[PDB]
């Protein structure tokens, strides 16, 4: 019900949030960074990949492709 209890996110990963580190020569500084990093962190670094996503990992890429071939064949 109250799942976003504060002091939960507390930037540790989310390499998007190293851009706030980039402005250290500029300085803003503190407010605020935890808005866009709501669901940037967590288990949301799954983040499906290159052509292997449209291959779906090339998972069954040759699965029964060679398993059917072959017998009889005399």
């Amino acid at each position: 019900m109250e799942l976003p209890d504060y002091k939960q996110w507390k930037i540790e990963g989310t390499p998007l949030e190293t851009v706030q580190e980039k402005l250290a020569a500029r300085g803003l500084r503190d407010p605020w960074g935890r808005n866009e990093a709501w669901r940037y962190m967590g288990g949301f670094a799954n983040n499906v990949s290159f052509v292997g996503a449209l291959l779906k990992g090339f998972k069954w890429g040759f699965a029964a492709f060679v398993v059917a071939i072959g017998a009889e064949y005399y």
Partner: protein, 57 residues
């Protein structure tokens, strides 16, 4: 409402029903088995070619 069988979230990634992924992974296998007759056996152009018919005299 009446039935909360899929709950709302606060970005905690509500998951699947642990049976949808079976039908999901089943229809990637049926198409990459269907690359069978794409290569074995079907080539680029099964026609035969001409060997440059210059000597016509």
């Amino acid at each position: 409402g009446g039935g909360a069988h899929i709950e709302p979230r606060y970005r905690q990634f509500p998951q699947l029903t642990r049976s949808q992924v079976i039908q999901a992974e089943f229809f990637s296998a049926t198409m990459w088995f269907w690359i069978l007759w794409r290569f074995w056996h079907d080539s680029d152009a099964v026609l035969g070619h001409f060997p440059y018919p210059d000597p016509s005299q």
